[PDB]
Each structure stands twice: as structure tokens, then as C-alpha cells.
Amino acid sequence: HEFVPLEVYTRHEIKDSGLLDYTEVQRRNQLHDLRFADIDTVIRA
Amino acid sequence: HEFVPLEVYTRHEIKDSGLLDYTEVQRRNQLHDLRFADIDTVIRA
Amino acid sequence: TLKESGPALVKPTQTLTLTCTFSGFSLSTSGMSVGWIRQPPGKALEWLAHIWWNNDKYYKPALKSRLTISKDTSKNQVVLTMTNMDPVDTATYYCARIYYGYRPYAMDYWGQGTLVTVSS
Amino acid sequence: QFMGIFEDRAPVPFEEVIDKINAKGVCRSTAKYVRNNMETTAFHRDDHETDMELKPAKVATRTSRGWHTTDLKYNPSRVEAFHRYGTTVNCIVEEVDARSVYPYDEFVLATGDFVYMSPFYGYREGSHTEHTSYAADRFKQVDGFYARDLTTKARATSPTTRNLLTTPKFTVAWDWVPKRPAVCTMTKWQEVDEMLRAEYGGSFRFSSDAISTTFTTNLTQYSLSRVDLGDCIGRDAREAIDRMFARKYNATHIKVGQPQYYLATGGFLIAYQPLLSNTVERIKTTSSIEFARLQFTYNHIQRHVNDMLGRIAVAWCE
Amino acid sequence: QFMGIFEDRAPVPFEEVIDKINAKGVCRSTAKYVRNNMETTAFHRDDHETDMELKPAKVATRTSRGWHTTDLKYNPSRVEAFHRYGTTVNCIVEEVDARSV
Amino acid sequence: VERIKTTSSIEFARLQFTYNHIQRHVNDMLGRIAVAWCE
Amino acid sequence: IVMTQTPLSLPVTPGEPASISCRSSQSIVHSNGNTYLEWYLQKPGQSPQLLIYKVSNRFSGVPDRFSGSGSGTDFTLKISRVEAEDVGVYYCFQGSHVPWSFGQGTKLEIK
Structure with missing residues (x-):
């Protein structure tokens, strides 16, 4: 007989069952300056 | 026959697989005033 | 491919500037670095400075206070400046290109070098 | 009355990190x-x-070392009915942990801030092709860096390669190591003294009595080049096999050929070293080994009964 | 020197969404x-x-689409020994994921 | 004074019980056959 | 790290092997695990050219006569059969640790 690998929920399912992920939220939030702004330009007048 | 307890990933491994942990981050961040500042002192002049 | 340009006669206690023109590489690729080297007549080679593609300049600590290496990719050149010229520094200056970005060997292609003499 | 408290974090320039702090x-x-x-200055x-x-x-308990310059916030001297501004600049240094995950193109600090650069960005032999999200002038790799501990005030003799990055908020620095021999997409999980290998039905069954586990693999070996960042598997397998053979089988058995690599259902990479008596993809692994154990169990019992009953049959016959 | 940076996120009115952006x-x-x-206006x-x-x-890697109007923060022109205020409005539109349980 | 760490999977123990149970039976039953055979 | 190339002058008859040795005050071992010590040669009135890199690797366009060896702080260039064109100045240069430096260099003589 062969027993195939069986499981009700994977690690991905359990991790995604969380309504929010702190890591993902921070990752997307701290790219705000890189995306919707220019870090490097210096305007002096 | 003896079956020793065998498991691919422990609770510790799964919990640490997370790139960031909100609890640890907040715990370290809210000690900022206790470590790099002096809460108790009052300076009046 | 690396040219060498510099005053052949500079009076003591003056600023000196040099120039190294490239060919077949630009100091804007992700792994280019260019170094300035000196050799007094009849003495050993002496490494002075090197600059990476990202304006990361490294100097010789003894001559740190005087050397100043800069890069202009628009003209495709590196300018080495050495203030407070001293007759001890009469020597031949070489420009070298480094493949530490790509290969474990540095300073593969050298310019012919220019002789600079410090006298009045 | 406090009418507003602008609290900001500014990076420390490289020339202040190397010349002054270190x-x-x-x-x-x-x-x-x-x-x-805008280029601001705060005194x-x-x-x-x-x-x-x-x-x-x-x-503080369970926290890494930290250093700071000022401990008291400076507030303006009292002047009757006048809004007055007061500045406080505190230079802070914190040793932290940093964590990265595949494909290791960005890493995180223990403060919850991110640095959008591969931990292995560098200057030598393709170490500049790793991902970077910042301008090239924000990075500085000091080669041959002498770390000076700020507590003992003693200079470390052995130099190390120190990456420094000046993010808009802070400045990170970390020792540089090559990517290929540092990370791996596989982890050594178990060491099996006696892994009996059998061939049957165009498949290899590897049974370990020590942990009661049976894996099933295809007949062919697994191309080790197919594993992404698979530089650790060879070293770990060789070291473990050599140690284990020296510990147990040196006096009775001998190695047979180079260690072989097989892939077992559920995503388990088995390195097998046969013994004789003197006479680019990423593999996903299941989180439950139990099935394999079951197999071994179901094998074991079955084998025994399929033996014993069979003998009875013959014993009946005669 | 920066003496304070009030950063806020204001909503875009409906009539500015359907008529203008869409x-x-x-x-x-x-x-x-x-x-x-209080009803506030930022110019x-x-x-x-x-x-x-x-x-x-x-x-950015592994990020959804995004649009913005301004790319540089506006800062007041230099005046000797004076506190000066400068306003910047960057209208941002981002596709995002929403999750419910 | 130590804090005991507990495994997250009880399955092994359950397996043991199962492997015990069947085994015991056959180790007891087959044995009878042997005796019954010998006699 | 300071390189000390010895001897300063090496008179060698053609066909006879020649030895150059240089020592550093500190290990030239990098965190890569590699020692970026390379030997360069300068011919009379010519820009110096690289001979050997990473101790024991011969640069492209270099004959088999030149061979480098050593580790830690000691390193040796060996020429199995010196030729007429081998005349010149030899330098050992460490690139692993900034600041970089050359040795004093050795001048080959043919007898």
C-alpha cells in the first residue's frame, strides 16, 4: 500500500488565514517613499 | 518497536519562520524611552 | 585603453591635477573601478588611490590628507588631484583598471603612465 | 504647554561613522x-x-547593547507668553539582529524597519548584481574594517568587510559574506545510521528503523544542480556521512561510491551512502512526516504477517 | 532646519473620483x-x-500598481530668521488587496 | 528547576499504541497456532 | 598589511630556477577565504603587467614557468626555467585588505 502525503491545511493556508500579516503590511508601507516620492533629489534655492 | 517523537518543523521553527514578529518588534520599540532616555527626571527653569 | 594626462612640470607647494581617459569600459557599469598608482624613479610601485563606479573613493592613509580622486562619466574620465606638491613626489603616475567587480585579479590594463617632476 | 513635538530619525553619514564613531x-x-x-541641520x-x-x-532585559550621547531632552528656557522652539539631538547606536528570506534581495532589522537591499550586495565577483533599491551613492563597502567595541574600547585585530547603507531614516552596517556559501534552500534534518534501501516496483524504498520512517523515491537520482542555492547540501552530507561512518562502520563496512541524492515524496532530499560489509527550482516540503511513518508501520506488520502466514501455508501443504 | 512636518492623508471626494480621476x-x-x-483645505x-x-x-518588486501627481515635496523659499510654512498635496491612487473573514 | 518542552504531535504515541495492539494480538494468536501445531 | 619582497636583487643564470619570497605583517586572508595576493612584472621602460593572481593562478598570456605558492603571511614566486625575457622588476601586491600596498620589488639579473 502507498500512503500519499495528506494534510488538512498547509503552512501557506495557516499563515494566510491571518487577516493581516505584519511583515507584508510593513513591507508595502515602507516602500511608500521609494514609490510615491523621490528620496535623493535636493532642491536648494 | 519504539517510535521516537518525530516532527519536521517544531512550533519554534514555524513561529520563527516569520520574517518579522509584531510582539517582539513592539516590545523592543517601546523600551526605547527606558533605554536611550530618562523618563523620570523633570527639569524646571 | 587608459590614457594619462598631467602637468610634466609643477612648482613645489602647488596643486596638481591628472586625468585618465578610458576606452572600452565606462565608470558607470556595476563593477568598474579605477586606481591611481605612483612610482618614484628607481623605487618600488606605490598604490595611491582608487575609485569605484559609485563614488566610493579609497586613499592611501599616509597621503589621505592630500589626495582627492573624482570621477566624471560624462567625459568618461577620472581626475586625480594631489595638493601641496613636494619634490619628493617626482615620479611616474599610472592609471589602472580593476576587475575585482568581476575577476579576482586587479589592475589588468595600465596606461603608459606620465612622468611628473616637481621643481621650479 | 507642549504645542508640538517633531520627533525624527536621521542617518549618520559614513564619514561620521568611520572617522568619528568607529x-x-x-x-x-x-x-x-x-x-x-531639503537639506536640514539640527544642532x-x-x-x-x-x-x-x-x-x-x-x-533592559533580553535586549542587545545600545549606546547614546544625550539622556535628557532639551526644552526652551521660559519666556512669558512666547512660543519657543528647542532642539535635542541624540546620537544612538544599536546592535540588532537582521533577518532575510529567499530570494534574499531585502532584509529586515529587529526594529521593524526594512532595508531594501540584498544582505550580500558587495564589490567582488558579481556581488554587485544582487538586488538594490537605493541609489548607488547610499552604499559604501569598507574593505578591511577594524571594528572598535564601544564598551571595551579595544580595536579588533582581524579586519572584516563592512557594508554600510545610509537609508533615509538610519544607517545600517553589517559584515559582508558571499551569498553562495552562506544561504541554502535545504536544511539537514535527520541523520540515519541504518537506512535500508530496497528496489521494488520501479521505486526505491528507504526504511529507517531508528526513526521508523519509510520514504519512496523514483529510481533515478536527483540532479543536485537543479536545486537553487544548493551549495550546502554537498558539504553537510559529506561531513555528516564521514562522521557517522567513522563513528560506527569503520571496522566492519566500507563506503561504496560517491554519495547519491534522491527526492522522496513530500519533498525530502535523501543523501545515501551505500555500505558493503568486509564479506533551477525550489523543492516544497510537506509539514507532516506521519504518512511515511505509517508506511513503515504498514510495511513492517505486513511483511511479518506476509512471512508468517506464508510459512503456515507451506506448513499446511506438506 | 525642519521645525515640524504635519503629514496627513485626506480622502478624495466622490465627485473628484468619478468626474476627474476615472x-x-x-x-x-x-x-x-x-x-x-473642521473643514480644511490644503493648496x-x-x-x-x-x-x-x-x-x-x-x-517596486512584488507590489501592485500605483499612480501619483507630485514627486517632490514643496518647501518654503528661504527667508532670513523666519518660520515659514510650505504645503504639498500628492494625490495617490493604489490598487490594493482587501481581505475579509 | 526546569521547564519541560512538549512535542506538538501526539501521533507517534498513537502509532505506538496501534503497533502495540496488533502486535500483541498476533504475538499471542500466532503463538497459539504454534502450540496447536506442535501438539 | 606590509609586503616584504626578498631578496631585493636576484642574479640568476638562464635555465636555472629562481625564487622570490615576500611576507606580510598580517594574514592577507579575506572573509571570502581567498588571499588576493598577486605578482606583477615591470619590464624596462614599460607599464607593469600582471603575472599571477590569487597566489596560485597564472594570468592569461603567462607561460608555465611562473608559479606562485604559499599562504598565511608567506608567499613565493618560483620560475622553473628563467629566460632572457624574464629580466625586470617583480612586485607582490595584496588587494584583500585596504589599504593596498606593493612590496619593495626585486630586480632580476642574468648571469
């Missing part, structure tokens, strides 16, 4: 940095620029 | 919104109201 153990009392596309206590010592931070 | 592809340069129970670059184009945001 060398002299002091830090400038003025923070000069670009914020919101501590609204006073002249000064070099201030870095002293150890107050002890 | 139809014309532009966004107003003044943000009018209710905050802390970008301390100037008149204007319609500004929404250009794509700079590319």
Missing part, C-alpha cells in the same frame, strides 16, 4: 541630513557643533 | 476634507487649484 568613539552633536527633499541644545561621547544605554 | 485621468491639486471636526505648492496628471509610481 575610530574615536565619539559622535557629532549636529545632525545634517536630507529630509523631504544639539541649539548650541555649537561638538563631539559627544557614546556611553552605554540603560540595561 | 473620466479625465487627472486629480485636483487642492485637498478639501473634514479633519478633527498644493501654495498656489491656485489645478488639475494634475496621474503618472505611474516608480517600480
Whole structure:
């Protein structure tokens, strides 16, 4: 007989069952300056 | 026959697989005033 | 491919500037670095400075206070400046290109070098 | 009354990190940095620029070392019915942990801030092709760096390659190591003294009585080149096999050929070293080994009964 | 020296969404919104109201699409020994994921 | 004074019980056959 | 790290092997695990050219006569059969640790 690998929920399912992920939220939030702004330009007048 | 307890990933491994942990981050961040500042002192002049 | 340009006669206690023109590489690729080297007549080679593609300049600590290496990719050149010229520094200056970005060997292609003499 | 408290974090320039903090153990009392596309300068206590010592931070439980220059926030002197502004610049240094995950193109600090650069960005032999999200002038790799501990004030003799990155908020620094021999997409999980290998039905069954586990693999070996960042598997397998053979089988058995690699259902990479008596993809692994154990169990019992009953049959026959 | 940076996120009114962004592809340069129970208006670059184009945001790995109008923060012109205030309004539009349980 | 760490999977123990149970039976039953055979 | 190339002058008859040795005050071992010590040669009135890199690797366009060896702080260039064109100045240069430096260099003589 062969027993195939069986499981009700994977690690991905359990991790995604969380309504929010702190890591993902921070990752997307701290790219705000890189995306919707220019870090490097210096305007002096 | 003896079956020793065998498991691919422990609770510790799964919990640490997370790139960031909100609890640890907040715990370290809210000690900022206790470590790099002096809460108790009052300076009046 | 690396040219060498510099005053052949500079009076003591003056600023000196040099120039190294490239060919077949630009100091804007992700792994280019260019170094300035000196050799007094009849003495050993002496490494002075090197600059990476990202304006990361490294100097010789003894001559740190005087050397100043800069890069202009628009003209495709590196300018080495050495203030407070001293007759001890009469020597031949070489420009070298480094493949530490790509290969474990540095300073593969050298310019012919220019002789600079410090006298009045 | 507090009518507003602008609290900001500014990075420390490289020339202040290398020349001042790492060398002299002091830090400038003025923070000069670009914020919101404008070059601002903040002077501590609204006073002249000064070099201030870095002293150890107050002890907190389960926290890494920290150093700071100023401990008291400076507030303006009282003037009747006038809004007055007061500056406080505190140069802070914190040893932290940093964590990265595949494909290791960005890493995180213990403060919850991110640095959008591969931990292995560098200058030598393709170490500049790794991902970077910042301008090239924000990075500086000091080769041959002499770390000076700010507590013992003793210079480390052995130099190391130190990456430094000046993010808009802070400045990270970390020792540089090559990517290929540092990370791996597989982890050594178990060491099996006696892994009996059998061939049957065009498949290999590897049974371990020590842990009661049976894996099933295809007949062919697994191309080790197919594993992404698979530089650790060979080294770990060789070292483990050599240690284990020396420990147990040196006096009775001998190695047979180079260690072989097979892939077992559920995503388990088995390195097998046969013994004789003297006479680019990423593999996903299931989280439950139980099935394999079941198999072994179901094998074991079955085999025994399929033996015993069979003998009875013959014993009946005669 | 920066003496304070008030950064807020104001909502875009409906009539500025359907009529301006979804139809014309532009966004107003003044943000009018209710905050802390008062009606506040922010004029970008301390100037008149204007319609500004929404250009794509700079590319980031594993991120959804984004659009913005302004790319530089506006800061007041230098005046000797004076506190000066400068306003900047960046109209941002982001595709995001939403999750419910 | 130590804090005991507990495994997250009880399955092994359950397996043991199962492997015990069947085994015991056959180790007891087959045995009878042997005796019954010998006699 | 300071390189000390010895001897300063090496008179060698053609066909006879020649030895150059240089020592550093500190290990030239990098965190890569590699020692970036390379030997360069300068011919009379010519820009110096690289001979050997990473101790024991011969640069492209270099004959088999030149061979480098050593580790830690000691390193040796060996020429199995010196030729007429081998005349010149030899330098050992460490690139692993900034600041970089050359040795004093050795001048080959043919007898």
C-alpha cells in the first residue's frame, strides 16, 4: 500500500488565514517613499 | 518497536519562520524611552 | 585603453591635477573601478588611490590628507588631484583598471603612465 | 504647554561613522541630513557643533547593547507668553539582529524597519548584481574594517568587510559574506545510521528503523544542480556521512561510491551512502512526516504477517 | 532646519473620483476634507487649484500598481530668521488587496 | 528547576499504541497456532 | 598589511630556477577565504603587467614557468626555467585588505 502525503491545511493556508500579516503590511508601507516620492533629489534655492 | 517523537518543523521553527514578529518588534520599540532616555527626571527653569 | 594626462612640470607647494581617459569600459557599469598608482624613479610601485563606479573613493592613509580622486562619466574620465606638491613626489603616475567587480585579479590594463617632476 | 513635538530619525553619514564613531568613539552633536527633499541641520541644545561621547544605554532585559550621547531632552528656557522652539539631538547606536528570506534581495532589522537591499550586495565577483533599491551613492563597502567595541574600547585585530547603507531614516552596517556559501534552500534534518534501501516496483524504498520512517523515491537520482542555492547540501552530507561512518562502520563496512541524492515524496532530499560489509527550482516540503511513518508501520506488520502466514501455508501443504 | 512636518492623508471626494480621476485621468491639486471636526483645505505648492496628471509610481518588486501627481515635496523659499510654512498635496491612487473573514 | 518542552504531535504515541495492539494480538494468536501445531 | 619582497636583487643564470619570497605583517586572508595576493612584472621602460593572481593562478598570456605558492603571511614566486625575457622588476601586491600596498620589488639579473 502507498500512503500519499495528506494534510488538512498547509503552512501557506495557516499563515494566510491571518487577516493581516505584519511583515507584508510593513513591507508595502515602507516602500511608500521609494514609490510615491523621490528620496535623493535636493532642491536648494 | 519504539517510535521516537518525530516532527519536521517544531512550533519554534514555524513561529520563527516569520520574517518579522509584531510582539517582539513592539516590545523592543517601546523600551526605547527606558533605554536611550530618562523618563523620570523633570527639569524646571 | 587608459590614457594619462598631467602637468610634466609643477612648482613645489602647488596643486596638481591628472586625468585618465578610458576606452572600452565606462565608470558607470556595476563593477568598474579605477586606481591611481605612483612610482618614484628607481623605487618600488606605490598604490595611491582608487575609485569605484559609485563614488566610493579609497586613499592611501599616509597621503589621505592630500589626495582627492573624482570621477566624471560624462567625459568618461577620472581626475586625480594631489595638493601641496613636494619634490619628493617626482615620479611616474599610472592609471589602472580593476576587475575585482568581476575577476579576482586587479589592475589588468595600465596606461603608459606620465612622468611628473616637481621643481621650479 | 507642549504645542508640538517633531520627533525624527536621521542617518549618520559614513564619514561620521568611520572617522568619528568607529575610530574615536565619539559622535557629532549636529545632525545634517536630507529630509523631504531639503537639506536640514539640527544642532544639539541649539548650541555649537561638538563631539559627544557614546556611553552605554540603560540595561533592559533580553535586549542587545545600545549606546547614546544625550539622556535628557532639551526644552526652551521660559519666556512669558512666547512660543519657543528647542532642539535635542541624540546620537544612538544599536546592535540588532537582521533577518532575510529567499530570494534574499531585502532584509529586515529587529526594529521593524526594512532595508531594501540584498544582505550580500558587495564589490567582488558579481556581488554587485544582487538586488538594490537605493541609489548607488547610499552604499559604501569598507574593505578591511577594524571594528572598535564601544564598551571595551579595544580595536579588533582581524579586519572584516563592512557594508554600510545610509537609508533615509538610519544607517545600517553589517559584515559582508558571499551569498553562495552562506544561504541554502535545504536544511539537514535527520541523520540515519541504518537506512535500508530496497528496489521494488520501479521505486526505491528507504526504511529507517531508528526513526521508523519509510520514504519512496523514483529510481533515478536527483540532479543536485537543479536545486537553487544548493551549495550546502554537498558539504553537510559529506561531513555528516564521514562522521557517522567513522563513528560506527569503520571496522566492519566500507563506503561504496560517491554519495547519491534522491527526492522522496513530500519533498525530502535523501543523501545515501551505500555500505558493503568486509564479506533551477525550489523543492516544497510537506509539514507532516506521519504518512511515511505509517508506511513503515504498514510495511513492517505486513511483511511479518506476509512471512508468517506464508510459512503456515507451506506448513499446511506438506 | 525642519521645525515640524504635519503629514496627513485626506480622502478624495466622490465627485473628484468619478468626474476627474476615472473620466479625465487627472486629480485636483487642492485637498478639501473634514479633519478633527473642521473643514480644511490644503493648496498644493501654495498656489491656485489645478488639475494634475496621474503618472505611474516608480517600480517596486512584488507590489501592485500605483499612480501619483507630485514627486517632490514643496518647501518654503528661504527667508532670513523666519518660520515659514510650505504645503504639498500628492494625490495617490493604489490598487490594493482587501481581505475579509 | 526546569521547564519541560512538549512535542506538538501526539501521533507517534498513537502509532505506538496501534503497533502495540496488533502486535500483541498476533504475538499471542500466532503463538497459539504454534502450540496447536506442535501438539 | 606590509609586503616584504626578498631578496631585493636576484642574479640568476638562464635555465636555472629562481625564487622570490615576500611576507606580510598580517594574514592577507579575506572573509571570502581567498588571499588576493598577486605578482606583477615591470619590464624596462614599460607599464607593469600582471603575472599571477590569487597566489596560485597564472594570468592569461603567462607561460608555465611562473608559479606562485604559499599562504598565511608567506608567499613565493618560483620560475622553473628563467629566460632572457624574464629580466625586470617583480612586485607582490595584496588587494584583500585596504589599504593596498606593493612590496619593495626585486630586480632580476642574468648571469
